Amino acid sequence: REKELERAIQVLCRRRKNNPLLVGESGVGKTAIAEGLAWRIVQGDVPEVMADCTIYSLDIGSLLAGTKYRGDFEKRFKALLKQLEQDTNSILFIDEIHTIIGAGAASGGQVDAANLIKPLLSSGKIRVIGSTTYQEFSNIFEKDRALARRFQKIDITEPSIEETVQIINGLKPKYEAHHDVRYTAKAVRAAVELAVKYINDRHLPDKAIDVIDEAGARARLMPVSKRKKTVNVADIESVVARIARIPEKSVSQSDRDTLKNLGDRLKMLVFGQDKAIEALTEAIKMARAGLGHEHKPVGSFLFAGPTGVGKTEVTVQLSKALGIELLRFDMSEYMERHTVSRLIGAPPGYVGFDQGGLLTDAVIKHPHAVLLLDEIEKA
Amino acid sequence: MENFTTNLNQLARVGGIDPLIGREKELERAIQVLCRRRKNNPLLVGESGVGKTAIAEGLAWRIVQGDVPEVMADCTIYSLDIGSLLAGTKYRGDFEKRFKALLKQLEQDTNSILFIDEIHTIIGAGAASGGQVDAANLIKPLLSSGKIRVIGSTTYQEFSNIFEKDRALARRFQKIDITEPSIEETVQIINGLKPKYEAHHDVRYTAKAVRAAVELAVKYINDRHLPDKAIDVIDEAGARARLMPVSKRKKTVNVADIESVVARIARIPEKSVSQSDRDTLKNLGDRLKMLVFGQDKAIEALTEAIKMARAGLGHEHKPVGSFLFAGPTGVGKTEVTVQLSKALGIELLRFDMSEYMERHTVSRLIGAPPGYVGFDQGGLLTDAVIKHPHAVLLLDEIEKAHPDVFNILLQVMDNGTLTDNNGRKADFRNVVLVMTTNAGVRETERKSIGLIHQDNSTDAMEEIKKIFTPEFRNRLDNIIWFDHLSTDVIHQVVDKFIVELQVQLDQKGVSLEVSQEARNWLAEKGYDRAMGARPMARVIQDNLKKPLANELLFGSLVDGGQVTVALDKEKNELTYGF
Amino acid sequence: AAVELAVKYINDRHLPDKAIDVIDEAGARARLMPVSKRKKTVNVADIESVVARIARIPEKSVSQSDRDTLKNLGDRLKMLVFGQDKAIEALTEAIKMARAGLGHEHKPVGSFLFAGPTGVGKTEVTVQLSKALGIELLRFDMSEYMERHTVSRLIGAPPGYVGFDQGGLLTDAVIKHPHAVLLLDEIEKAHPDVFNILLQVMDNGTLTDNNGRKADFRNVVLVMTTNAGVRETERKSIGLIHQDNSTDAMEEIKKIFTPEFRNRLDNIIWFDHLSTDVIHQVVDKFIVELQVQLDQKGVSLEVSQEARNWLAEKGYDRAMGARPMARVIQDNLKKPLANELLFGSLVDGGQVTVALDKEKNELTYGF
Ligand SMILES: Nc1ncnc2c1ncn2[C@@H]1O[C@H](COP(=O)(O)OP(=O)(O)OP(=O)(O)O)[C@@H](O)[C@H]1O
Ligand SMILES: Nc1ncnc2c1ncn2[C@@H]1O[C@H](COP(=O)(O)OP(=O)(O)OP(=O)(O)O)[C@@H](O)[C@H]1O
Ligand SMILES: Nc1ncnc2c1ncn2[C@@H]1O[C@H](COP(=O)(O)OP(=O)(O)OP(=O)(O)O)[C@@H](O)[C@H]1O
Ligand SMILES: Nc1ncnc2c1ncn2[C@@H]1O[C@H](COP(=O)(O)OP(=O)(O)OP(=O)(O)O)[C@@H](O)[C@H]1O
Ligand SMILES: Nc1ncnc2c1ncn2[C@@H]1O[C@H](COP(=O)(O)OP(=O)(O)OP(=O)(O)O)[C@@H](O)[C@H]1O
């Protein structure tokens, strides 16, 4: 994070409005950027002007505690700004800065943490570092434009894969000290890559750390006979597949047989129509071996023929045999050009907005499942 | 006035107030309002950072400088600090006592002026659950009598939503609209402010530097107003330049420095081309032509649009490029765009426009209006572009969306802006807009009747013209019609797919080699011009992946080695090994 | 005159306070007017000046440079939008009438429906008008108002709902800049329920948002640009004679907008296609813009007149207006210049020349 810290220090040296606002997605490490700037200050690995200044992390609860008797909060805050003004070598850090947009009385929503710092930030006597997410920044913060213009927004993007690997290698000492385990560098690279591949609803510099911490916590629970061991690609892969629902390594366990005798086991329940079972089993076996499509479903099959010859039967038996939740969607309920609103949800502002989609929520809840669309020609 | 106000004339005498430049009309109006008999209370309103507080403080500054008509002299101005005044008023009656004491001091002075910055803040001081005597009411009688003179300052939104909601207090103040300066006026303002920033940063600004800063802040920074973002760029460049002398890269502030600072603030690329970024574009067409075979004119168009954008001579307020890749299935329309996003290391914004089949789905793109359930969410398109101002926007199968949704892209392609339900303008000047379709293909896959077979080459263009409105097609940068894949293209494609399979294998510690006759046989088996390059990957799948997956999942190839594929001549089958 | 002006120009305050404020401020001004010891009686002109200062409206400025601005406004615009003279004339005459006092009593300065084929200076002349007049341009891309309930965005959300404190976009934009140019781009794309707002905006010059504020349109030049019937204008009719589809597009205009809406439009100016000389002028304008872009990089440029004729003949397409000319200028100059400028001879130095060869129909270049 050389460029982000460099731009933050450039902003902090401005004559007026020297208030960097670190805004990025959730889990990118803006709080980490601020705390690491402090940690660099204590180590002297900072530009000359940025030496000899101490960063204070301001907590709203501790300040807003007990402040009845109108005036108590205003007095507390004015005293805080006073003590901060006399330093010229102190930087105030507010972790969730979108939350200082109100502390005033409910009687008249008025002078609060916002309307009390505007003259101070505009006059450039004190310096504040902020941090917020995009969702809060664009909904709560930049509504007091006079407050938003006093902060210089700094985009904190999520690091790359190898940058994340270097971050994990820098953070490895503390996690190893906490869990009393060791992580191999190859296991770290595998953790970052698998977090990129499978953990889709969290951002990069955090989900890899999550995988590391969970692998360490679990490896501290394996030693039921004191089997402390270093975390390799295998255990971390299993921890990732806990969210991905399918381990790529573990197939060599008591599951290679299930794919081995899947076709014969299904032919024990669906007689005739052998090539359909062949195709389904071969697709599942390819996806399990790792020759699958990196951006496509395990399979996309069209089953045709006269009715009642086992088109749905083979699918339900497959879902049973693989222990996989069958997701059935009858395309007889979708004979209109406007029913897809129940598949994906209604646009914002409409009656069914907060209800969500059927197909999307089903797939999100069951990442590993079978999708069945009966009578696709009916839809 | 002891510990609740700040004597602005004292602060101006110690040089703590920046010099007021221009603003002669507004200052004259403020003086005229101040010299009224009753209700002589000017209210400065305007957008954020246009100079309201600046004008109010420059009034006292000029009073100290003597550049005032001989009626406002000796009138020392006090700025009110509401927090300091409300700090210790813990007990009832105390706030009213100190406020009345301040008002008595001001009234008996008969000469001072109270400048209440953020004057929208005094509509609440009371605590006894109602419409108590609080400062708003405590000053209402005096303004109507003109015994004291008060100057306010509040933004347009604050004034319109909070201040003027109290009609009785509002009618006691005279509104003075502080409009944002022009380019020349803000140039003069920066020229007048130059000594302070130059002494602060120990740098010198060239005149060309100031002019370029103002022009670039006008062009790129579109969320702030003039006299606040130009000096923002200037102060930022000064702070950046002052961090160089520690590395002894000390100089004056040249235009290139201002451009770098602006590119940083607006999060856009300006002059990185001076570095190893010219080579990035130089071999860009080559780097794509080895990932997407055939369809070369598309790579030419994309590369040339990006080159015109990075060189500087692109469009002024239009997207970097707005193309309509039309062609049959599986010819690389989505793939070339994905590889373009990958090559530039720039974020890809993917929008499968088949989920927008209904006219009312536009609320997903630009948000729901005020008063409706999804208001706090905002549009997907606009928020995506605001987060990533430099990106590639890909609209897959745009022909599948409801034809009314293209009117959204109308203004995106023409003016490069798009406003969501909060009034935010998504900036599309650094977005490579690509829309893919197979619109006119079905008409070209037509069998003519008669003795003479007729050329159907123009049917694709006819159908595209019949689908997209003329005012929409009129603003497309180019409509790159894609051709089918030929035999040699199929060879290159099966080679690409074999390389991808070889990487997938290397992931598992296995190696593969395929004979040349085996590659040609794979190319011959699954080649189909009507289906593009997907059936070739399908044939590679059912021919190599299945037997290889059986060898890998069971025994032989667990930690396997060099797998060799060879073609037979007696039967034309494939051989395998370990 | 003070009482009457405070009545009909100041509609946010009540009567026996705004007349008093006019009088008091005029007295204070005449008291500060002795910058040459000049104190006199307050006449009607001083009252009108104070009122125009308060209500934020243009005053009687015939003694100003504004007289000269309005004088050459038509000729100045005609040098930025070539052809389409009748629209520039209607705009300039409406603005002049509004300035001379012979405006409408309670109507916007003008409410014009700019229709016509594509690629012609329809939405462009409005921007150039806002630039020449130096007044703020309020641009509203009406293609985002396809949903019938987006009126809540124009005038705000009613009391009791989430978007209340945000207000309406159009009303707030007007209240901020009462003297402006309102560009409702692509007006035909909005849901028909949106035209009903412009109904009262055009007939009565006012608009009430959710907070009960009155948006005053009496100084706003309302301009709406449309493409109604453009699909018809580009269609070649069946028969030996190809017809003029202009009146067809007018009938489409009539079928889109209700009669009570078309009845209060000051004029429906049907823009016409661009001719060849107009295309030559357009090429010249684009070349000037490109030269400005290049001089921003320290690169000069000159093009032989024959090469400009070649570009015009290459790009001319009446059915598509002046937009394909930008694409042709791009394809023929911007790409070679870009390849020379990024990695080529043109780094940090220009003096590029262009000319047409007659045998090969190509262009020349070089340092
Ligand atoms: N640049 C970095 N270097 C080292 N470690 C890092 C970096 N970024 C993040 N981390 C670590 O990854 C985790 C996530 O980062 P961080 O906590 O700082 O962001 P955040 O405060 O959660 O942001 P937000 O408040 O928007 O959710 C942290 O535990 C942090 O230690
Ligand atoms: N090849 C088969 N093997 C085993 N059982 C079978 C076979 N064919 C049919 N059946 C029986 O027929 C019943 C219904 O079959 P199924 O639900 O799959 O209909 P289908 O093939 O999907 O055709 P459709 O739904 O269009 O009428 C099953 O309960 C099953 O017992
Ligand atoms: N008339 C002017 N001449 C020179 N410089 C100016 C003028 N106005 C403003 N500035 C500069 O622009 C900066 C911000 O403008 P200004 O302080 O006047 O508005 P503001 O009071 O901060 O508005 P708000 O509080 O609503 O954001 C000031 O710090 C000042 O240095
Ligand atoms: N010209 C090509 N050269 C090499 N490989 C290719 C080409 N086109 C496609 N492919 C491959 O075939 C697959 C499909 O490509 P792509 O999706 O970009 O085609 P498309 O034009 O978008 O088809 P559609 O009309 O359905 O949108 C990709 O995996 C891609 O790698
Ligand atoms: N009569 C003209 N003279 C010179 N230049 C012109 C003329 N018309 C258009 N142009 C140029 O061509 C471009 C398009 O012009 P404009 O946007 O005004 O047409 P339009 O009517 O708004 O198109 P549409 O009907 O699709 O909305 C502009 O950049 C403009 O500079």
Side-chain angles (χ1 to χ4, degrees), chain C residues 192-206:
Chain C
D193 291 351
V194 181
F195 312 143
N196 308 336
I197 324 289
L198 307 179
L199 264 189
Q200 81 219 57
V201 160
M202 287 182 308
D203 174 66
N204 195 225
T206 193

mmCIF file of all heavy atoms in Angstrom, chain C residues 192-206:
data_model
loop_
_atom_site.group_PDB
_atom_site.id
_atom_site.type_symbol
_atom_site.label_atom_id
_atom_site.label_comp_id
_atom_site.label_asym_id
_atom_site.label_seq_id
_atom_site.Cartn_x
_atom_site.Cartn_y
_atom_site.Cartn_z
ATOM 1 N N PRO C 192 -45.817 9.462 -21.143
ATOM 2 C CA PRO C 192 -46.740 10.575 -21.411
ATOM 3 C C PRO C 192 -47.223 11.287 -20.165
ATOM 4 O O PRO C 192 -47.575 12.471 -20.235
ATOM 5 C CB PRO C 192 -47.892 9.888 -22.151
ATOM 6 C CG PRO C 192 -47.252 8.736 -22.827
ATOM 7 C CD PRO C 192 -46.191 8.248 -21.883
ATOM 8 N N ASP C 193 -47.234 10.611 -19.016
ATOM 9 C CA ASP C 193 -47.654 11.257 -17.781
ATOM 10 C C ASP C 193 -46.675 12.332 -17.327
ATOM 11 O O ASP C 193 -46.961 13.041 -16.359
ATOM 12 C CB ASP C 193 -47.830 10.219 -16.676
ATOM 13 C CG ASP C 193 -49.011 9.302 -16.924
ATOM 14 O OD1 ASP C 193 -49.787 9.576 -17.862
ATOM 15 O OD2 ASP C 193 -49.166 8.314 -16.174
ATOM 16 N N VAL C 194 -45.520 12.456 -17.982
ATOM 17 C CA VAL C 194 -44.561 13.481 -17.583
ATOM 18 C C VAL C 194 -44.856 14.799 -18.289
ATOM 19 O O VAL C 194 -44.590 15.875 -17.743
ATOM 20 C CB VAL C 194 -43.122 12.998 -17.848
ATOM 21 C CG1 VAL C 194 -42.114 14.046 -17.414
ATOM 22 C CG2 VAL C 194 -42.867 11.694 -17.122
ATOM 23 N N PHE C 195 -45.424 14.741 -19.496
ATOM 24 C CA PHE C 195 -45.786 15.962 -20.206
ATOM 25 C C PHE C 195 -46.809 16.788 -19.442
ATOM 26 O O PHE C 195 -46.901 18.004 -19.657
ATOM 27 C CB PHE C 195 -46.353 15.635 -21.588
ATOM 28 C CG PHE C 195 -45.532 14.659 -22.377
ATOM 29 C CD1 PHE C 195 -46.153 13.718 -23.176
ATOM 30 C CD2 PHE C 195 -44.154 14.689 -22.330
ATOM 31 C CE1 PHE C 195 -45.416 12.818 -23.910
ATOM 32 C CE2 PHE C 195 -43.411 13.790 -23.061
ATOM 33 C CZ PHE C 195 -44.045 12.856 -23.852
ATOM 34 N N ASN C 196 -47.589 16.157 -18.567
ATOM 35 C CA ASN C 196 -48.609 16.882 -17.829
ATOM 36 C C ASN C 196 -48.011 17.876 -16.847
ATOM 37 O O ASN C 196 -48.700 18.814 -16.437
ATOM 38 C CB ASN C 196 -49.521 15.890 -17.116
ATOM 39 C CG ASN C 196 -50.058 14.826 -18.052
ATOM 40 O OD1 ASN C 196 -50.137 15.033 -19.261
ATOM 41 N ND2 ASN C 196 -50.430 13.681 -17.497
ATOM 42 N N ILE C 197 -46.746 17.706 -16.470
ATOM 43 C CA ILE C 197 -46.069 18.721 -15.673
ATOM 44 C C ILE C 197 -45.725 19.931 -16.533
ATOM 45 O O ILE C 197 -45.990 21.084 -16.161
ATOM 46 C CB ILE C 197 -44.818 18.112 -15.018
ATOM 47 C CG1 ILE C 197 -45.090 16.664 -14.612
ATOM 48 C CG2 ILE C 197 -44.395 18.912 -13.815
ATOM 49 C CD1 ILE C 197 -46.043 16.531 -13.446
ATOM 50 N N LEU C 198 -45.134 19.684 -17.702
ATOM 51 C CA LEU C 198 -44.834 20.764 -18.629
ATOM 52 C C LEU C 198 -46.091 21.500 -19.051
ATOM 53 O O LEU C 198 -46.016 22.664 -19.448
ATOM 54 C CB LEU C 198 -44.108 20.208 -19.851
ATOM 55 C CG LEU C 198 -42.881 19.390 -19.477
ATOM 56 C CD1 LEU C 198 -42.211 18.846 -20.719
ATOM 57 C CD2 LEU C 198 -41.928 20.253 -18.676
ATOM 58 N N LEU C 199 -47.249 20.841 -18.978
ATOM 59 C CA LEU C 199 -48.509 21.538 -19.227
ATOM 60 C C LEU C 199 -48.599 22.825 -18.415
ATOM 61 O O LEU C 199 -48.646 23.928 -18.979
ATOM 62 C CB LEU C 199 -49.687 20.627 -18.892
ATOM 63 C CG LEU C 199 -50.300 19.856 -20.052
ATOM 64 C CD1 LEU C 199 -51.569 19.173 -19.606
ATOM 65 C CD2 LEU C 199 -50.586 20.801 -21.189
ATOM 66 N N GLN C 200 -48.609 22.703 -17.089
ATOM 67 C CA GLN C 200 -48.732 23.885 -16.247
ATOM 68 C C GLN C 200 -47.453 24.705 -16.267
ATOM 69 O O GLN C 200 -47.498 25.930 -16.110
ATOM 70 C CB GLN C 200 -49.093 23.479 -14.821
ATOM 71 C CG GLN C 200 -47.921 23.019 -13.989
ATOM 72 C CD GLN C 200 -48.273 21.853 -13.105
ATOM 73 O OE1 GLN C 200 -48.741 20.773 -13.715
ATOM 74 N NE2 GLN C 200 -48.123 21.916 -11.887
ATOM 75 N N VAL C 201 -46.303 24.059 -16.472
ATOM 76 C CA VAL C 201 -45.050 24.808 -16.527
ATOM 77 C C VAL C 201 -45.070 25.791 -17.692
ATOM 78 O O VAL C 201 -44.544 26.905 -17.596
ATOM 79 C CB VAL C 201 -43.853 23.842 -16.610
ATOM 80 C CG1 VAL C 201 -42.634 24.546 -17.159
ATOM 81 C CG2 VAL C 201 -43.547 23.276 -15.237
ATOM 82 N N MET C 202 -45.706 25.407 -18.799
ATOM 83 C CA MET C 202 -45.724 26.265 -19.977
ATOM 84 C C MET C 202 -46.891 27.240 -19.941
ATOM 85 O O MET C 202 -46.756 28.395 -20.363
ATOM 86 C CB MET C 202 -45.786 25.415 -21.243
ATOM 87 C CG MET C 202 -44.497 24.698 -21.571
ATOM 88 S SD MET C 202 -44.655 23.774 -23.104
ATOM 89 C CE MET C 202 -46.132 22.836 -22.752
ATOM 90 N N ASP C 203 -48.049 26.801 -19.451
ATOM 91 C CA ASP C 203 -49.202 27.694 -19.458
ATOM 92 C C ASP C 203 -49.158 28.730 -18.349
ATOM 93 O O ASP C 203 -49.556 29.880 -18.570
ATOM 94 C CB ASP C 203 -50.502 26.898 -19.338
ATOM 95 C CG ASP C 203 -51.719 27.795 -19.204
ATOM 96 O OD1 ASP C 203 -52.033 28.520 -20.171
ATOM 97 O OD2 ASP C 203 -52.357 27.784 -18.131
ATOM 98 N N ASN C 204 -48.686 28.361 -17.161
ATOM 99 C CA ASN C 204 -48.690 29.258 -16.021
ATOM 100 C C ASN C 204 -47.301 29.616 -15.523
ATOM 101 O O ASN C 204 -47.183 30.484 -14.653
ATOM 102 C CB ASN C 204 -49.499 28.647 -14.868
ATOM 103 C CG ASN C 204 -49.851 29.659 -13.801
ATOM 104 O OD1 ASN C 204 -49.716 29.391 -12.607
ATOM 105 N ND2 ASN C 204 -50.285 30.839 -14.224
ATOM 106 N N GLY C 205 -46.252 28.983 -16.043
ATOM 107 C CA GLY C 205 -44.898 29.357 -15.702
ATOM 108 C C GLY C 205 -44.460 28.989 -14.307
ATOM 109 O O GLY C 205 -43.405 29.453 -13.866
ATOM 110 N N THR C 206 -45.230 28.173 -13.596
ATOM 111 C CA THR C 206 -44.908 27.805 -12.230
ATOM 112 C C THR C 206 -45.011 26.298 -12.063
ATOM 113 O O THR C 206 -45.550 25.588 -12.915
ATOM 114 C CB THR C 206 -45.828 28.495 -11.224
ATOM 115 O OG1 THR C 206 -45.289 28.335 -9.908
ATOM 116 C CG2 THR C 206 -47.214 27.872 -11.273
#
